[PDB]
Each structure stands twice: as C-alpha cells, then as structure tokens.
C-alpha cells in the first residue's frame, strides 16, 4: 500500500475539523419551512422566534436536522441504487471483472479519496458499499428525538452524508459502465433524439420511468433478439432514458431508444395517450400513474421492490396469463420482479395492447375546449395552488375570446403536476387545456442530446491545464440537477449558451442535459452539435445520469492529483482545500427539488466546489454564505512559512439561490475567481465577470477592485479607463508613464504563494 | 382599491403566526415613520407600471433601493440610489447587527417588499423574521405570511390602484 | 443445517403476503398530524380532503410514509446502538466468545426467526448486523420523492422495519449480556434504589444520560479500582441507568449505582443542582442541558459521535488540562471519545468540581416564590403551550393565596419540558415554581426496582404452559415504552397492580419499570417486593432497557417452538400466525413518544402481538383496527382439512390507543382472548374481562356472548345468571336441568381445531 | 360571556383550514337541526358540574351518547341511551358508510364533542374530517381546529354559562 492520508473511512468525528473550518468562513443560513416540529408525540412543538421544543432543540437545530434528513435520504437512494445494480452485475457477469472506465491513472477518485482503497475488480467494490451502508445507518440514528442538539454538528453530519452520497454514486456508475458496455471516456458519444415529438404513434410505444436500467436492459435485449426495433418505439423518462441510450454504445453507433423528457413531462405524456405500456422502476416516478392509466387503458408494470405501487404480485405466474388478465381489464398492472419474464412481458404486452387502445387520450377536442374554457368563473384558486405561480385565470379569460396564446406560453412554464385541477370547483382539466393549446409546439418538440461520455480522461485534463493556466479557459461550469425550473426549461439553455460563447468548460448531466438539448438556433442546430463534446474550452460534454455527477466532482479531485502530485488516498481535507483555493469550478442546479440534488450539492461543498441553486431550492432550509464585509473572515495560512495570508473574497458562497438566469450567470462568472490565479487567468475571469455584469445588471460591479492586485489583472480592452477609475475613485497610485500600478492594492501579487486553510500543512 | 384586506387566503401555512393585513393608510404611515427603511425590490418591478410606481415611492421619501435579482437595469437612468444585492445574501446580512449596510451607515430596521415571488420572499423572510428584529411591509400583490405587515390578495389593476393611493398619502 | 422456512432474510417483497393478510382484517387507520407535505421543493403541498400533491401522493400515502419514516428511524437507533456496542465488545473481548444467556434451547429467537441463523459466537452476529444495515438502507431509499406510491406498501415496509428493529435489539442485548456480565435469565435479580431522593448531596454526584454503557463501564471500573464507591454517588437517567445497574450483577449482589428517573426528570434534576457532573452519550438526551449547566456551573461531557453537542473535541488532550479549563470556566464541557481517558476524567472532574458549586440551584426561595407567584396576571399562554394540558393559571392563582397544593399536584403530571416558560411574558420559571412547591414530595421520592433479568428461560415457559392451558393464568401483559404519560406516572403502576392481583403475567421494561417501582402501598413496599420476579402467574419480571424488549416478543416465539414443535428458522409467517391465533399476550406503551416505541410496536404487530398505547400515540399517524361488525372479516382456515372456520372477534386491534388507564385495563383484559382456547382459559379470561368492565365502565359488556361456545365458557360464580341473560335476551336454548347449552352459539367448541390464516399450511 | 368567539388562539396549526368559531345560538340551531346526531363524550364530562349539563342536552333532543374512555359510569343512573366505544375505534367506524352504528340503524351525519382532550380529539378528527363527510360541533372550552364548527377558548365558568345558554335555546 502507498501513502495513506490522515482520514481514511471517515466518521462524524473524523471530518469535524475540516467542516468547522469551512463553516467558520461560509456560515450556514437557515430558512425554515415551518415554525413547528412534528417528529415525536411530545409535539408538535412551536419554535417560532428560535424557541426550543419539549426536547430542548431550537428552530435552528430543527432546520439543520431537516436538511440533514434530506441529505441522508438522497445518499440512501444512490447507495441503494448502487448496491442493487452492483449485486445484479456481480450475479450476471461475475465478481472478478476488471474495472473498465477509460484511460486514467486514478480510476475511482471519490472512492480513493474517501476510503483510501484502490479497487481493481467488481468484487472490490463490495466492501466500499458495506462501509457506505454502515456509516449511513449511524447517520439515520441521529434523526431520532434526543440525539444531536447543536445545529452545527447537524451541518457536519450533512457534509459527511454528502461525501458518502458521492462515493455511492461513483460505485454505481463504475459498476454499470464496466458491465453494460457504456462509452468509456468517449469525446464523440452518439447523439440521441429527445422530445415529445420524437415518438411515433403508428407503432406500439413503451415508456420506461425511473432510474434503474437492470430490467430495461432485458427488455431491449428481447426487442433486439426478436427483431422488433423497427416495429416498436421505446422511450424513457428521467435518467433511465440516459441509461438506455448509453447501453452498448461504446461502438459509437446511434441507438434506437428515445428520451421523452424529464419528470415534468410524465403526466403530460400519460395525458397524450401515446404510451401503450408504462414500466416503472424506482426513483422519480409520479404516484398517480395508475389513476390515469386506468382511464386511458395504459397498463403499468412495476419492476422493483422499492416501488410496487400496491399492485398484484404476478412474479410466479405465466406471461400469457398476465397478458390475458391485463387485456381483459381485470388488473391495471402488476409487479414483475423476475427480469427475464419482464423483458418478454413488456414488449408482448405493448404489441397486444396497442390495437385495442389506439385513439384514446385526455386531450379535449375543439368543442370540448370551448365548453371547458367558457365554464370558468375566474375564482383564482388554480393560481393559488400553482407551484410555479402561473397566471391561469388570465390565460383562461384570454382564451375565452379565442386568444389561446396565453396557454401556449404557460405550457413551457408548467411542470405538469395537476395540482390546479384539484382546487377547481368547476372541474376543469387545466393541464389538458394547456396541452391542447400547445399541441403544435408539442408536435414540433424535437432535439438532439449527446449520450453520456462517462468520466473525464487524464489526457483531456492535462491538455486543459495549460489552457487554464495561460488564461484561455476562464473556468469550469457544471449544469446539473432536476427540472423544477421557475421560468421554464429554457434558462439552462440560455446559461449554457452564454457560457459556451465565452469559452468556458460546460459539463451537463441529468434532466438539465435533456432540457438544454431541446432548443435550436436559426440553423436548426442544438448546442450539442454546435459545440464539440470534449473536455476543453468552448465544449459541452454530457456525463449521463445523476450517478455520473461524481465524475464531475471526481474530475476536480484529479486536478489536485495529476498536477500538484497530491496524495488522494484518505486525504479529504487536503484535496478539498486545494480545490477551494485553486480550481475555478462552479456547479448549478437550476431546478433542484429532490433529496438527491441536496446530497449532491452538499457533497460538492465538502469538496470545495461552490454551487448555485434555483429559487425553489430556498425551501431546502440551508445555505452556506460568507460575510464579505468581515475582513477577518478572509485570512488563510502560507504553506511556505506558516505566515498569515490575505485572499480576495472569492468564492463568496458555497450554496446560495439565485432568482433569475441573468443573476445566475453573473454569480457563476464571479465565483470562478480563485486566490491562486496567475495574471492571465485573473484577467480573463475579471473580463468575463465585468462584461456579464454590464450586460445583465447594467452596472459595473461595486467590488471589482478587490480582485485587482496587478496592472496585468485588468481586461485588455478596458485597461486604461479601469486604471483611471482606480486612481480617481480610490486614490490608488498608478505609474501613468508605464501603465503600472505603483501602490494601492491590499493584497500583493505572488504566484509562488501557497494559500491553505489547514495549519498542519505549513512548514 | 382602498380595500386590501378582504382576501388573505393561502395554500399552505408556515404556522400559527401570520402577518397582519393592513390598509393603504397604515402602509403609508408605516413607510413614512420608519427611521431607516430599505426598499427591497425583485425583478417583478420590471413591469413598467410597477417600475414608475416604485420609482415615485423611492423618490418621495428618499429610500435606498436594494435591487435583488436582475432588476438593476430598471434603475440605471432613474435618479435614485439603487444597489444590487443577492436576496439570499441580503437576508443573511440583515440578521447581523454589525453589517455596515449598502452605504456603510449601519443596519436597517424596516424593509419594504415589492415585486417578488411568494415562494422565495417567504423563504427569505422565514430567516429574517425568526433570527432578527427587522420589520417588513409587503406592498405586493400576494399575501405574504412571513412578513410583519402585508397587503391582501389583489389583482393587477387593484394592486396598481392601491400603490397609487399609497403614493398620494406618502 | 436444519429445516429452513420459506422466508429467510426477508425483504419488502418477501413479507408482502403476510402483511396483506394481516391488513385484510386489521385495516390501517390514518390520523394525519398535518395537512401539508414538505419533503421536496415542489411543495409544501396541501393534501386536505385526501388530495394529492405535485408528485401524485395523497394524504393517506403521506401519513403512511411519515409513520414508515418514524419506524425506520427507531430501527436505525437500535441497530446503530447494536453495531457500536458489538464492535466495542469484539474489540475488547474477541469475537470468538460463546454466547451465554441462560438455559434455553433457542438462544436468539428473533435472529433465528428472521435470518434463520444459529449464532454461537460473538463473531457470528457480525453478518446479521450487515444484513440489518443493508436492508435498512434500502428502506430509507423509499423516503425519497417519487418512490412507492400506495399507502399499503408503505405499511408493509413499516412492518419490515419493525421486525428488523427487533432483530437489532436482540443483537444488542445478546452482545451486552454475554460480555458485560449481566444477569442471565435470573429470576432473583437484585433490587435497585430509584427516585430523586436516593442521591445524596453531601457527596460528589455523577449523572449519566444515554442508552449505551460503554463509557460509563470504564467510569465504574475507575471508581471501583480507586475505591471511590462510598465517597461518590453515580446515578443514571433513561435506559443507561438500567444497563449500568445490570453491569457485573451475575453475583446477585446489590449495586451501588442509582437510577434517578426517566427523561421527564432530566431537566428537573438539572434544576435541582444535585448533579456535580453530567455525562451524556446518546438517544433520549435533552438538547438544552448545557444552556442550564452554564448557569448552574455543571460540566457536561459528551462521549459519542452521535451526540457531540457542539462542544470542543478534547479527545487528544491531557485530562489535567481539561480539568483545569472546565474548573476555570473556559468551556462548559468537551467531547471525550477516548473511553480510557473519559473513565478517569469524569470522576476526577466530579471530585474537583463538587466543592466549588455547593448550594447553587435554580429552585427559588420563599420570598422569590412569593414574588414570582404575585407577578402572574393569568393570561393563559402557559396552559396553551403545555403538552399535558395542565391548569397552570389556576394553580398559580390558588398559590397567590398561599395554597401551594395545586402546584404540588401538578408536579407529578408535568414532564419537565420548559415549554411554558418560553411563552410567559412575565418570565416566570414555572417548572422551578412547581418543583419548589413539590420539594416535600421530591425529598421522599424513593422506591425499589428489580434489575434486568435478561431473557425468559425455557423451564419457566414450560412450567407456565400448564397454567395457561388449565385456566390458571389468564394471559400475558407486557408493559413497555416511554414516559410521556397523560396523567402522571401512576397509571402504569395502577394497571400493573390491577393485573398482578388477578394472577396475570406482567413483564416490564424501560422507563415504565422505573415509574412502576416508584410507588408503595401502606406497608411501604413496592410491587417488586410484593410479587416475585420470575416468569409465573402473579409475578412481575423486569427485562431491563428497551433493547431487552426483543426478549418479550422473543419469548412468544419460543412458545411456538417449545409446545407445537414449529420450526423457527426463517418462518416469520407461520410463527406469527401461531402467536396471533393461540397466544394470549398483549403489550402496553402508556407513554410512547419516541420512534423506538413506534418501531417496537410495529415489530410486535408483525409477530401477531396486539398493543395498546397512550393517547399521545394518536400522533403516530397510524393504528391497526378491525371491523367487528363485518362478519366476513373474521374467517380462517382449518389446518386439518382446509375448511373455512369462524373465530370470535379477538383481538379486535393490532395497535390502538386508549384514553384513561381504566379503559386501558378493560381493553388489555378483553384482548387476551384467542380462538384456540380450551374451556378453562376462555372461562377465566371472560371472568376477568367482565369483572374489570363492571368495575371500571360500570356495565356488562355488550358483546360478551360472542365469546361463548360452551356452558363451561362462563364465569364459575356467575354461570346461571349469565345463562338466563343468554336465554331471555338472545333466544338461546339451554338445558336448564343439566345446566347445559343446547343451541345458540354461532361457533361450536372443538379443541382439536387448528385455526390458521395461511392456506398453504392446510392439508 | 355569550361571545365564545373572542378567543381562537392556538399553539400549533394543522394547516390553513380551521373550524369555524360559532356562537351559542348557531350551536343550538346546528344541534337541533341535525338529522341524526351523536353525542360523543369523554372522561372530562365526569365533572359534577358538566355531567348534568350533558345529560340535559341529551334529554332535550334524545341524542344517543357514545361514552368514550371511562365516562360510562356517569350515565348508568340517568335515563339516557349511552353506549361505550373506543374513541379511535369510533373514528375508524365513522368513515365507513356501511357501519350499522351503535343501534344498527346506520351511520351518523353530525357529532357533538364535549369533555375531551385537545390532543386526542384533534387527532381523531384529523381522520374523521379528511376521510369522511361527518360534521362535528365542539361544545368544549378549547378551540378544536379539526372540528367543523367549535366554541372558542373559554374559562370553566364561562364554558358552563355558554352550555346553559345552549340548553335554554335548544
Ligand atoms: S414540517 Fe411539514 S409536516 Fe411538519 S408541521 Fe411543518 S408542514 Fe406539517
Ligand atoms: S422532537 Fe423535540 S421539538 Fe420535535 S416534537 Fe419532539 S419534543 Fe417537540
Ligand atoms: S379554479 Fe377553476 S373556476 Fe377557479 S379560476 Fe381556476 S379554472 Fe377558473
Ligand atoms: S399542473 Fe401546471 S398549471 Fe397546474 S398547478 Fe401544476 S404547474 Fe401549475
Ligand atoms: S414529496 Fe410530493 S407531496 Fe411532498 S412536497 Fe414533494 S411533490 Fe409535494
Ligand atoms: S404565561 Fe405567565 S403570565 Fe401568562 S398565565 Fe402563564 S404564568 Fe401567568
Ligand atoms: S414544563 Fe411542564 S408545565 Fe410547563 S409546559 Fe411543559 S409539561 Fe406543561
């Protein structure tokens, strides 16, 4: 074994020092969802005004505990996914298959960073899952009444849950990529079609919803073996679609499976009537699917123990009997946990069900729409019950005259939750009305998205290191998370295009990749075909599902390893400090709603990676924000001599929520600045940040001068006027005969300086 | 018009304590009696009518503006003192009594809210009203429960009329 | 290996049939604690009127999910406790130590029933914890948004979490009893002093709060080795008191440690100033102990990673330095995770701190009480904020005249939650006022409690079998749970005395045993001295901490194995059916508040054991109640021939809540009746049930005639009058010359009949 | 006094939907207009000053009584039709429209609550009001949020005076 760091297999106590060091600067800000705690029967306790309950826990402790519970729930859903996938893979392919990921010296940066192990076979991932489970259990034991009382150890345990979540995601992704023939660090992954307008109603259509791909692989194996690829359409919602589109795609051949959309599309697709059978696996699946499929005669087949849906368990019955029972209407679906029989039942069920249910949908006709629109009274309940705050009464009133453009506009912003329909005393299917009004847009809804490339190889990172140093790549922008967007699915596209035009590195994943790939320019090209898919400036790469997010974070770890020679094994604090002080990389979850997104964000924070969330994420009850005005907060140590060093206030947050995509763009541009940047990197980052601020907020930033330590730290195009602004408004002394800053900056420039947040790394 | 209290309906509630539904006279008095007020403005003010109404309100009583989000371009040409700040940051800073403020003269005691989303401003006020002593007046369309005082649920024309009647009593 | 049942190492799918069979009769009843769901940022969603949220989950699904989360939280806190304790035990003693627990053919009935494993060494419990952990993770993954939709599959997963919790408790108790020298099936466990008046203020006082006795074991070792037993006082709150008392008590000698009380006493003792040092470990610890010890100069030392309390981590520092820092007031405590250093620091800290904090307490003097009582203005906020609904304003008004009897009455009912003080604008320490008013009662608060006896031996069960079948023992009453009582800590004592006088079998555990042992009769004797402590009629036995509850249910399993020769290995359905149809045992949690109590109740339900909980438990959001009026609900199969058989409606619930202890007594007496009873057992059960109903409700039960198949099924002393009541009100034909029932019973008597709920168990 | 609506304060809330605070006249009208009412009493009715009030109320309209808990011994002497039932069992049965009832003549439409605990009756009503259509009138001294209509927060003497007024107006 090689050199091991101070923290192998961390626990709550083992990472407390680093977490408290982080919280010293980036203090937690709690935005509680309630004023009450509803945990034990001593309550519910009122905690308004930071009052304490019957157990002594105050409002801040309750908010921290709620966020910690969210984080551990997300960590438990990637870990359970990882364990189930790894167990199936070991059962099928054997437990001695060498890990096949690509071309990198470090295969599993997250696993090696946390546990210190260096796996080489699929059987060597088994212990890591045992650890990830064991610690997880301990963490859940803290949600009990009477456990941790302080609100800071809850935050520390949340960061521990985040890093464990990243480890579980890495394990799952490695297992599936090694076994199921996913692309291996391919910078030329095949382009797959996305959108509701891709599925063809002529052929039977199968819709797979969930995250696991174990059963979908059997389904597509049966479809290929029996030659039904051209006679049947297969589509996926959520990340399971990405998993199908990566399956057996290392040959760089276009696939036949199609991605339908994100979670917000699910009900809409069900209301369209296009699906002839819906097979659900587990995570991110609407709970009212049978309640609509029974009306539209769409069978529902469950394939997981996590989500059985209260359906009859026909695992031991014959496929023909189940097909007959579903055909004759006895049951609306079934639980079929046997993958071999499921992979035959699903396509056969689609084939035998398509002719009997063609032409049935919930979309109203012209006269039905006219009557439904004329039925409304404008009572305002639907607008109150809309999560996205959509002007539904105004849209309906405009549609009364015959102006159906308002509902067409509302279609993009709506997330298809039908929560409005349950508060309408007139019983108006508002979601169906909006869908019918946007029928044309739905028909012309197509796009291209690049398949999951896997993890970033060492060669690409090494090539991009020079670009980062020489000030040609301003930074790294990751666009991940869910699809609970506040203003439709175009904001992610706008942000990605804006940052790609400025030669950033954009890495996407999850539903955000789907919604980015749904829009084209005048030439009818998406971003994926407009920009290359490598890891370099001006390129947008797709890692795949949420379990590939680890790769993103993992990439940052390799930057600390392959460039500074740092040891990865069990060295979380050192690598996190390096990443926080030197690497300019920001994540963005514009529509995060699920606990998986919270766990991913917390794990990214513990690795030193700041993230910007959508406004809805303010309901997560925790952010990490720094006090810019407090000059004593921004002080570090010098690794050369142990001296006290000053750093500019960047990044100014670890987790914060933006409100509009323009503010998000400005924040992402600003928070890519790091204290270790050389002159060229600082210059390009300042140029882009100032230009974006002028473009979107209309003013020059009020704190830009905090990042100007050298005359070569200013934009080339606007250097002299910025020097004049420094001299006149601040009194800095500038050598006007040499265009040099004589004096005035608080922090001098020293590229050889090594900032650090850990005292034990000095001298 | 004058009535901004007849509708205080909500979908979900944060708890027992809720903001008081006030009238235009009370809102104008509270704005005009504050020792150090701050006009926290979201990007919903970009509506032209709300834009000039907010500009007139800020001009009448010399109230500094915190243009959260991307609402700054609506104040570049108007002769007011508006500065950009993140709403989640601003809410964090308000709970600290040692924060110099947007001009370095100290913290504020009363904030005025106009042109936000009812799920974001409510989340920020959840921290502000529980971990500080800053009072909030919501002159927006929606009934903000987490404020200290707020308008009722009004339509666009009703909101415009209420803002006008406030501006005349300012 | 031997015979294995159909369900070894169960999962969610493997126990769905038995869960659905149980839910067919005992339907779940949901009593939601809230009208909103707040799990993801799509919400909070209003679900009033059984409406669905943005994910499609309705109100019933949300209530089921909340109860499932409570159950898995409790299961995770006994499992984490078990893993930590077992790891420490293996590290100290080695993993090849034989499991010695007493005289029983089956050592671990729960483990053998669930996993089908026969562990013989402490290293053979390690895999079982791995399973208990691993499945646990999957269960937590269901708490996510978009997971299982139907509420019935949430109830099934809750039952799975309950049985897993029982397995974890069994592992915990096995390890600790084997290693730490606890009594092993000992029917002569030593008596232990309990109460607030036991501790002596003239000596240094250590107070241990927690559940595990790993560090306090080192503390006691240091105290004994250095001969400080007679120079100091050591007391325990919550289950750690029971565990520290049982420590090294195989010799049947009286311990020197004392038991202070339950959780409701914690703050009270802190307000008394009697403790000189407080050491906190884990579950059931108030979160404001430091906030009071700062005022009263009481150091608080943490000893677990679960509960660190935001204190400085001085694990690697010298004990003398920590003692000096605490003495000089720099810090109010520290995290001391090193057991060897903690076991020395705690007694030394108490010795060095006792002389410096004598005579300091929060209890007011006479003039201060006069002022505080005269300050109140009777605004009614404290009564509103009181969890137990106490008439505090009336008590204070009565005390204004000098009548302090009302507060003395209120002292027993209060639970030490300080919630009133936070809503008093006059700033009156109401809890301190009540404590001072009841100082005289507190001074004489003493009692005796029998130490934890471990698990019930085989010989005692075999001896009691004859008494059960010859109508000598009416049934088994388990009294477990927490101390969130609605009317003080005397109702449990009254129930236990009432059922002990009628020659039931009473088994106690947890805080309920503590509160039973606190009351005496005229002769000044507790129940533990009035009745013997072995498994026999009219005897009360104590199993110890709630981790010993796995013995109680476990005992029931042995009843299936010993007498019917049933195979235990992986046979949950068969053993549960046997217990539900034949064993007359019922449990009672009068003050259940924590998630551990919910998990224990659910696990007991999955084993066929009905439970009655206190009224506060209605906040658990789920009960299991049967439809007595639905005659088609009560039908079973006959094992001899597969025919349909009718059974009387007993038990009528699997888990319910009562309002007063008299109703609880009536319900417990009624629900000990089982279909597979001979004449004598049914007769004695009916006699006791009818007498208790007449005594407490004042009327004869309206459905007694349902449990009458034979003239020998009636009470001996009231046979002819009941026969007349049957004849004149129902039309039954009775042979008045032979005192025999000719016709009228719906269900005939057949002692050879074998009722069952599983058709696969028939011919 | 007669008000019974002047105080509707709560410590914790179940949601935005609350029971309506009614007066004695409205309560008497609702009780005397119901088609099939049930008087669900708890142990708190055992007070020698409330038990007779409850008996008079039941006698005025011949309302059958469900004596939940251990309140049955207070109705043996009085010539009323009182039957014992578990409160949780009663709440479960009320949601079933196929339950014959305490006399076999079917289910009930409205229930009257007196003498319960604020945290137990609220929990039972949390199921009754969400999974059925049975209306509830609370004539207790605590403001029951989960009922359909309920008295305010009253003192003991005020509650007894209000009960007397309801009795005289029945
Ligand atoms: S956190 Fe959610 S469930 Fe708990 S009281 Fe608040 S709204 Fe109700
Ligand atoms: S956990 Fe604490 S705050 Fe929450 S209900 Fe229980 S006693 Fe109250
Ligand atoms: S809830 Fe129905 S009736 Fe009311 S405004 Fe909305 S669509 Fe119209
Ligand atoms: S379905 Fe669409 S319009 Fe209706 S409430 Fe949900 S998001 Fe709003
Ligand atoms: S989990 Fe479902 S019900 Fe709960 S807040 Fe999210 S969308 Fe609403
Ligand atoms: S809250 Fe204080 S002032 Fe009000 S009644 Fe209670 S003790 Fe008296
Ligand atoms: S401390 Fe006691 S009296 Fe005060 S609110 Fe809590 S339980 Fe009631």
Numbering used by the authors:
A (entry chain A), C (entry chain B): 39 to 801
B (entry chain C), D (entry chain D): 1 to 170
Please quote the authors directly.
Carbon monoxide dehydrogenase (CODH) and acetyl-CoA synthase (ACS) play major roles in the global carbon cycle through the consumption of CO and CO2 gases, production of acetate, and breakdown of acetate for methane generation. By contrast, methanogenic archaea employ four copies of CODH (α2ε2 heterotetramers) and eight copies of ACS (β monomers) that interact stably with eight copies of CFeSP (γδ heterodimers) to form a massive 2.2 MDa complex called the acetyl-CoA decarbonylase/synthase (ACDS) complex. ACDS plays a central role in that process, wherein the A-cluster of ACS cleaves acetyl-CoA into CO and a methyl moiety, the C-cluster of CODH oxidizes CO to CO2, and the corrinoid of CFeSP receives the methyl moiety, which is reduced to methane in downstream methanogenic metabolism. Through plunge freezing of the ACDS complex, we captured multiple subcomplexes including a CODH tetramer, a CODH/ACS pentamer, and a CODH/ACS hexamer and characterized these subcomplexes via cryogenic electron microscopy (cryo-EM).
With the next-generation chameleon instrument, different dissociation behavior led to formation of (α2ε2)β and (α2ε2)β2 CODH/ACS subcomplexes in addition to the α2ε2 CODH subcomplexes, allowing us to capture methanogenic CODH/ACS subcomplexes. Additionally, from the chameleon-plunged specimen, structures of the MetCODH/ACS pentamer and hexamer were determined, each at a global resolution of 3.2 Å. The structures reported here reveal that both A2 and A3 of ACS contact CODH. On CODH, the interaction surface is formed largely by Rossmann fold 2. Interestingly, the C-terminal extension of MetCODH, which differs from the C terminus of non-methanogenic CODHs, interacts with ACS. In the structure of MetCODH/ACS, we observe density consistent with CO binding to the proximal nickel of the A-cluster. The environment surrounding the CO-bound A-cluster of MetCODH/ACS is remarkably similar to that of MoorCODH/ACS. Substituting for Ile146, Val149, and Phe229 of the A1 domain of MoorACS are Leu504, Val507, and Phe601 of Rossmann fold 2 in MetCODH, respectively. Upon performing cavity calculations on the MetCODH/ACS complex, we see that this enzyme uses channel 2, like CaCODH/ACS, but MetCODH/ACS uses the channel 2B branch. In our structure of MetCODH/ACS, the channel between the C-cluster and A-cluster is open and resembles the open channel near the A-cluster in MoorCODH/ACS.
